[PDB]
Write an enzyme that holds these catalytic residues in place. Structure first.
Site, PDB file in Angstrom:
ATOM      1  N   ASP B 357       0.992  -1.292   0.058  1.00 19.58           N
ATOM      2  CA  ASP B 357      -0.115   0.037  -0.050  1.00 19.58           C
ATOM      3  C   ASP B 357       0.768   1.150   0.022  1.00 19.58           C
ATOM      4  O   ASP B 357       1.722   1.310   0.778  1.00 19.58           O
ATOM      5  CB  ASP B 357      -0.828   0.038   1.258  1.00 19.58           C
ATOM      6  CG  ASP B 357      -1.913   1.081   1.327  1.00 19.58           C
ATOM      7  OD1 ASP B 357      -1.854   2.166   2.100  1.00 19.58           O
ATOM      8  OD2 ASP B 357      -2.684   1.206   0.256  1.00 19.58           O
ATOM      9  N   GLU B 393       2.477   0.242  -7.327  1.00 19.64           N
ATOM     10  CA  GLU B 393       1.876   1.206  -8.087  1.00 19.64           C
ATOM     11  C   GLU B 393       3.033   1.828  -9.028  1.00 19.64           C
ATOM     12  O   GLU B 393       4.423   1.766  -8.494  1.00 19.64           O
ATOM     13  CB  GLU B 393       1.342   2.255  -7.392  1.00 19.64           C
ATOM     14  CG  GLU B 393       1.811   3.094  -6.509  1.00 19.64           C
ATOM     15  CD  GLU B 393       1.168   3.710  -5.322  1.00 19.64           C
ATOM     16  OE1 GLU B 393       0.016   4.288  -5.609  1.00 19.64           O
ATOM     17  OE2 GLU B 393       1.887   4.035  -4.257  1.00 19.64           O
TER      18      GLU B 393
END
Lengths: 699, 666
Positions: B357, B393
């Site tokens: 995350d 990401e």
């Protein structure tokens, strides 16, 4: 038309699965067009039994499962690709290659012009492409059974001997037991021979805790060495990082070297003895361009090797050997870490000693891998517990250059051996310098480890002179190596004691024997973990050869003759080692308490501390250490006085406070009653070139 | 000192470790800067007061260790650490505070809040310099010695082939929400690991056709004081306090080792099913927040190590995430903890992958101390960690680019923008034609830059789901003036049944596009059940009806599930959408693509695979435009629809409708 299956990428190499009844095969190659697995029947090594084209590939990894093959199965590879040497592309499928992840190799290479991949021979040299098959001369990788019955349960898990309690023993596997005549022929100078019942009790009787074995990775004798009728005796040319050397196997080379090694280690552990292995990662046996195509160069030259940019036909050399692994590529750095992990979990080795570590760190630094390589070791579950031994290196601006060193990191202190050699030779040395060496070298270890035991103290090693030759020899005699004596270290700081080599002069021998004793106590009286050269106890000699890397013969073999001179020394070493182990005064964790003295028996002011000396006197004062290694129990060691007289002349010493009792000395002669116990500052007539150790007895 | 009798033990493995031979427990704890260390033993009934105080007297390097005979799995302990309290030097050791073991594999309950858990007088002039006296025992949950052994039968699915990234369809799912209001299951497994693993799930999900489950956070996390005081509970798990413990909250079998057990079984079922588990990790901050933070663990154990302090004011903590602290990844033990935790959850908890995350922040924190690249070398060379899937990401760190040599061999990325792109073509606004042509292609303009590395996700745990904006086109409950979460997810309002006509066409659409795109697709959990958050796009403290999966079929869902099932079925049937690339293409009408045309901000996409062959037509759009099929035979298989199929829709003219998407074969 075989029920072959894709198999798995992991683990690298050949893997026998009980359940699927067969062997998974896997090989890393990024630049290959095509890969071929070759299986060989024991009966015929010249032509494969079966050839299997490896068609499944996951990322950079070729793999196939092959049912029905079993532990003991010989194999190799032929790898396909472009051959543009100018682009560093050296794919030659005519050359039968060794699996990089082989856990065993079935013998040595047979030197023949056809293991090269270029024509010899031709005047384009390494530009050419040799068509000849190499299989006839290239040993085959072997599928092994990884299973082994370890009952070194007591040892392995978990708390073995630390560096503060370690005496290391540098010993060649072959030379150790080649002439131990009370062993059966076929096990003499082998892994099994080394861990045999009497060898174990010998090493136990000597008192050493840790064995450092000289290279056991499967190595290759150099062409230029065999053309001269010599082998590579020291084993500093790995061709594979996972296989025990076939040469030191008593039980054959189709798994036997793996089994005997595993056996040998297990025995050693059960005896309370640690195994360090000497390991080479800084180069491979393949050499430079011009060297053989045996493995890596055939599998994928571009990966694996550091190439000269602007001329990729040439290899970068940091060591003078000819090549450097391409440690920036994730597979190559993986192979190294995979090697280290293998030898610990599977071969149960307690740590490593990196040969040419300054070079190895230079290579790593070269591609920005040094600090990450150190973090990899430190966070790894198994690797962060082993011992890791290296050497100092300032690179290249260069202070070590490294966030954090492993908990059990230590370095060979060549400065300790030089200083000590020079001192006893008669060279008056700055007091501060000789003293620091004895204190474990805090001037070198400011923030390298915060412990004296990061320093590996030694007087001799596999490099240069055997303690015997050190005291008997003024220059090397290496003509036997066939380099017209140009090879081997020239700065030796040695002294022949009045005659070069063997002599009848009992004045020379008395010098020598007395001197050996001097070094042996200097070494086992100093802070830092000491390492002893195997043979030194046996008064081993290579008769002036200071670089016997290629003498697999009479010269290097351990000589088990019970001569009374030799025997009496073996007795001394035993006694001193025992003394060292017996007293944690000479084994302190935090020094980075003592009081140093002058001739006239007073403390040492600057100037005295700064001018050259030939005589060191000091007291290991105090006792209360913390602990011991058990729950909350502090011990107290007796206080000791050490007198080292290198001055070639008798000298008169004023003793310090209390009663002192001579525990051991280099006097070969009998001890006079006024030398056994001394009190109230009264002076003793210390002989020249003499070492002495006293314990206080009051108050 | 004490008794007891006590073996010094071993420094490794870090944590509590019971050995079933010496019939005792081994305790090991890191603290470079500790003066004194005290193990605290606790009876499962008395927790205000410690049953035993044991002085940890041996250390090997920077590891304190002691072996205690007689103890076994189930034992409750915590630590007490002595050392200087000079918070201006960053040194803030507080013995009065009972600390969790960073290496605990199980924790007993959440923190019961109180002025005492802080290491400074909660109320004062010099907050965060003051020395609090109050004991923290009662409040601080206790670390639990665990039962490591567990019987796995998934030996068949562990090795080998775990569903590859190509064949993968991922399913993002929160644990409680998944089966809290799944009523047909006992009143104690609802919203638990074992609940999620009931034999009525699994048969459901295997029936649904997803092959990978990606759990929201399961790293034992605490509550922000500091929120619950608003009567909300952290429902997203993105604020952990330990990295080795399954979260207490989602255990059907208690919190003294049953979290470990419920989780393992969960997986062991999922694996036997033939499906894959990825867990959602957080490594960019601990739950202790900044200074003025609870002294739960790391602050107490060793503040210097563990936390990146502000130089010149070590009073304070460097923050990269806006959560109050960053772990000191440059200290070998701190980096080791992270890599140990990743290794634990894989070898020990049989997990198949992680999703980091706030990866960019984590990459940046790693970068801040020269560890990004060495972190990545560690992962690739690790025998176990290199085999697992890894999901982050995109980021642009340091001095441009990624600043990494190589990525792990199953690396993939949440394509942050593929969702901003598909939610704009369907949205109607002016949209380029090489742009959306890219999105469907795999987004090859950015990694292994081979299509599989992209996580094509229409919906994340972020908002909406599916529509639920499109409704919007509800951040009030979260008690901070409604300014929290993303700023525009790019959706319609669709504003009845005649002023909601597009809703079911604003479903199916994303679906038919997402499953057709090259790469790997992500559905939000329960978009096929037509999930809803009554408007929210930031439902992180909604342990409410808002978030929990509504399982009672309102009728207009259930048709949609039977669509998604058949939609994903197609992608689970043909290798024509699982490659690294033969694509077509076709603008309106009939015409093979040129360069006008290539950059024209409108709403029309068609393509083909030669290349089982398939024709695929997709469009937006505000009104009807002429439609003509291209070269070769066309046979329908699936679609979006305002009605049903009639009639019979070589070469001819159709012609297609409005808000809608369509397909064919050969």
């Amino acid at each position: 038309d075989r029920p072959l299956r894709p198999g798995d990428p992991y683990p690298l190499g050949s893997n026998w699965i009980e359940d699927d009844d067969g062997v998974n095969f896997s090989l890393f190659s990024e630049n290959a067009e095509k890969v071929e697995l070759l299986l060989y029947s024991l009966t015929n090594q010249k032509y494969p039994k079966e050839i299997i084209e490896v068609k499944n590939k996951t990322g950079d990894i070729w793999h196939v499962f092959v049912p029905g093959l079993r532990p003991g199965q010989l194999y190799a590879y032929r790898v396909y690709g472009p051959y543009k040497p100018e682009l560093g592309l050296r794919f030659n499928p005519n050359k039968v290659l060794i699996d990089p992840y082989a856990k065993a190799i079935n013998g040595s290479v047979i030197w023949n012009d056809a293991v090269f991949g270029y024509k010899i021979g031709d005047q384009n040299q390494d530009l050419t492409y040799d068509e000849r098959d190499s299989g006839e001369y290239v040993p085959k990788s072997v599928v092994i059974n990884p299973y082994f019955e370890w009952d070194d349960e007591d040892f392995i898990k978990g708390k073995k001997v630390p560096l503060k309690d370690t005496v290391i023993y540098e010993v060649h596997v072959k030379g150790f037991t080649k002439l131990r005549l009370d062993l059966p022929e076929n096990i003499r100078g082998t892994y099994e021979g080394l861990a045999s019942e009497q060898m174990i009790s010998y090493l136990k009787d000597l008192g050493i805790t840790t064995v450092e074995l000289m290279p056991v990775f499967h190595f290759i004798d150099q062409r230029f060495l065999t053309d001269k009728g010599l082998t590579n005796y020291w084993g500093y040319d790995p061709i594979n990082f996972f296989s025990p050397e076939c040469r030191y196997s008593s039980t054959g080379c189709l798994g036997g070297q793996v089994l005997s090694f595993k056996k040998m280690v297990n025995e050693l552990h059960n005896a309370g003895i640690e195994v360090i292995i000497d390991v080479v990662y800084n180069h491979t046996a393949e050499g430079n361009h011009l060297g053989p195509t045996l493995s890596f160069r055939g599998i994928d030259n571009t990966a694996y090797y550091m190439l000269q940019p602007d001329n990729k036909r040439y290899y970068l050399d940091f060591t003078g050997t000819g090549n450097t692994l391409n440690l920036s590529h994730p597979r190559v750095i993986q192979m190294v870490l995979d090697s280290l992990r293998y030898w610990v979990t599977e071969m149960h080795v307690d740590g490593f000693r990196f040969d040419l570590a300054a070079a190895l760190a230079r290579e790593l630094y070269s591609v920005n891998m040094l600090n990450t390589f150190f973090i990899a070791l430190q966070q790894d579950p198994i690797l962060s517990q082993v011992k890791l031994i290296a050497e100092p290196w300032d690179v290249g601006q260069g202070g070590y250059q490294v966030g954090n060193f492993p908990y059990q990191w230590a370095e060979w202190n060549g400065k300790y051996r030089d200083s000590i050699r020079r001192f006893w030779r008669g060279e008056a040395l700055p007091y501060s310098e000789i003293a620091n060496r004895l204190l474990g070298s805090p001037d070198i270890y400011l923030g390298n480890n915060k412990t004296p035991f990061a320093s590996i103290n030694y007087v001799t090693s596999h490099d240069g002179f055997t303690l015997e030759d050190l005291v008997s020899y003024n220059q090397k005699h290496n003509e036997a190596n066939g380099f017209n004596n140009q090879d081997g270290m020239n700065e030796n700081y040695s002294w022949n004691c009045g005659a070069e080599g063997p002599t009848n002069d009992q004045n020379v021998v008395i010098c020598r024997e007395k001197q050996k004793r001097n070094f042996m106590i200097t070494l086992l009286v100093s802070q830092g973990t000491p390492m002893i050269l195997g043979g030194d106890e046996l008064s081993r000699t290579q008769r002036g050869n200071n670089n016997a890397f290629c003498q697999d013969n009479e010269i290097t073999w351990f000589d088990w003759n019970l001569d009374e001179r030799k025997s009496k020394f073996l007795e001394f070493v035993k006694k001193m080692i025992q003394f060292y182990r017996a007293h944690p005064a000479f084994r302190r964790e935090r020094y980075f308490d003592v009081t140093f003295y002058t001739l006239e028996g007073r403390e040492v002011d600057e100037k005295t501390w700064s001018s050259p000396t030939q005589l060191v006197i000091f007291v290991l004062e105090g006792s209360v250490m913390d602990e011991i290694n058990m729950y909350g129990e502090r011990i107290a060691d007796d206080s000791f006085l050490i007198i080292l007289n290198a001055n070639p002349n008798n000298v008169k010493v004023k003793f310090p406070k209390g009663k002192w009792e001579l525990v051991i000395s280099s006097y070969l002669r009998e001890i006079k009653p006024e030398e056994r116990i001394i009190e109230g500052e009264k002076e003793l007539e210390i002989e020249g070139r003499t070492a002495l150790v006293y314990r206080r007895i009051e108050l």
